[PDB]
């Protein structure tokens, strides 16, 4: 039985009216419905969407179980976290439009019931939910393991995913050690090439008459602070004052930390928030929270984003929030994606403590022409293409990307495979490590092994050019885009990517 694209949302609304928790998600969908429907039709017109098998898909939202104790549903409308719920909403909508057979679960009862009656070919779950899956199913949970796609915002690096290696390194993460293929982890932003980038869609309501008259609509000296709760505002006053010299400063806050001059609007409904963004020249980052959606929404509406620079980068080594996350990734700014893949004039990444630099950025932004912008990968059509490619082409059970995409590179000592790929405008592709892990295979890529040994280490395969000595991976679950060798070179698998669609190679569709 073959999937048919859907262009009507009534079945979806009915499925989401089954739990109150889904209420917030259901409303965002309704606001974005016409965009979604334009996008599935446009994709079907550009690319052949026929001949897809209709999948039975479990979607288990562990974060919405009582049993998790997360209280996300509870605070959804009153200024709590929404990033995750944005992502889930967009994933469900995508699956529905592509014509799959979605069974949504927010409870142990439903999880048990859907798995109970068989058929399931694909499972979207979070880490909290994955623990529940293992516990509910007992030992046969491993039978489903290759169908798992695990929503994990900040990402999982190989050294935390391999249970035995993580313990040999003393890592106490409660989040790691599932022993999956790390490409099964689905992230919020393309920051972890050991994982896959899932993302979400950036909500925007600018017609092309809004964009032509955007200069009438936007008040040139209006800034808005990013930061829904009071805590995030501690010790920002110098920064805010420099901004307040040039611009009014507005906030949407659910207050001891906020100066008297700030103009508060409270927490706004999605529509009202979108209008406030459309009238705003400058969205002001305070440092927290890390890697959320809100800055991209502002950029889509023509705001510049002032992005706090982190020198040293923040990570588990230096920031409590990061301790125990199953990754050693370092953030160079509040929103590294915004910093690296968007940049000026939309994104000004600045040292909050450099008054001169802050002042120059504010005066610059004040003087910039308004240019609303969205990377393609965060549109409806671009997210549909990405997830459609993943469902049709990612298989961890029984060759994608195809070998023709492989471009081998040598990281220097002190540089990771992530880095050397990125420096040549490529991205690391962990599925190709298996093709560069033997004497023969090396010769090809213009490195000669005068002696090899095996090792079980994330930093290998490695090459010493002085000694012509090669080390190969002994444990194939330890292949790792993350990690730099302190003294040797790494042999690194890179691939190309489509403009504005970093998850997909040119030949991947
Ligand atoms: O007054 C507000 C402020 C924010 N948001 C939304 O809350 C979401 C979460 O954005 P943020 O980057 O703050 O991430 P979080 O930390 O909540 O995951 C975004 O879609 C914002 O538009 C909202 O609905 N009303
Ligand atoms: C709301 C939610 O579950 N979000 C994230 C999750 O995606 C991530 O896997 C985990 C570990 O870093 O931290 C939390
Ligand atoms: O991870 C989601 C959520 O988990 C905890 O249980 C809560 O107390 C929150 O502070 C946190 O954000
Ligand atoms: O985003 C909500 C909250 O979920 C939990 C943890 O992921 C935190 O790291 C995060 O802030």
Author numbering: 214 to 467, 471 to 614, 618 to 728
Sentences from the paper on this structure:
Toward capturing a BH-MGAT5/UDP-GlcNButAz 6/M592 crystal complex, we crystallized a variant of BH-MGAT5 bearing a substitution of the catalytic Glu297 to Ala to prevent UDP-GlcNButAz 6 turnover without altering the fold of the enzyme. However, soaking experiments using UDP-GlcNButAz 6 ± M592 failed to yield any structures of the binary or ternary complexes. To understand how the BH mutations are positioned within the active site, we solved a crystal structure of the triple MGAT5 variant E297A/F458V/F517L in complex with UDP and M592. This structure closely aligned with the corresponding WT-MGAT5 ternary complex, with a root-mean-square deviation of 0.49 Å over the entire protein (988 aligned residues for chains A and B, superposed by Cα atoms). The gatekeeper residues in WT-MGAT5, Phe458 and Phe517 overlaid directly with the BH-MGAT5 variant residues, Val458 and Leu517 (insert). While the latter amino acid side chains adopted a similar spatial trajectory as the parental Phe side chains, the space occupied is substantially smaller, enlarging the active site as a defining feature of BH engineering. We further investigated the combination of UDP-GlcNButAz 6 with MGAT5F458V/F517L, now called BH-MGAT5, that showed the most favorable conversion among all putative BH-enzyme/substrate pairs. We found that the azide group is preferentially oriented toward F458V and F517L, well positioned in the cavity created by the BH substitutions. In contrast, our BH-MGAT5 variant displayed increased acceptance of UDP-GlcNButAz 6 while completely losing activity against UDP-GlcNAc 1. Taken together, BH-MGAT5/UDP-GlcNButAz 6 are a selective enzyme–substrate pair, mainly driven by the negligible activity of BH-MGAT5 toward UDP-GlcNAc 1 compared to WT-MGAT5.
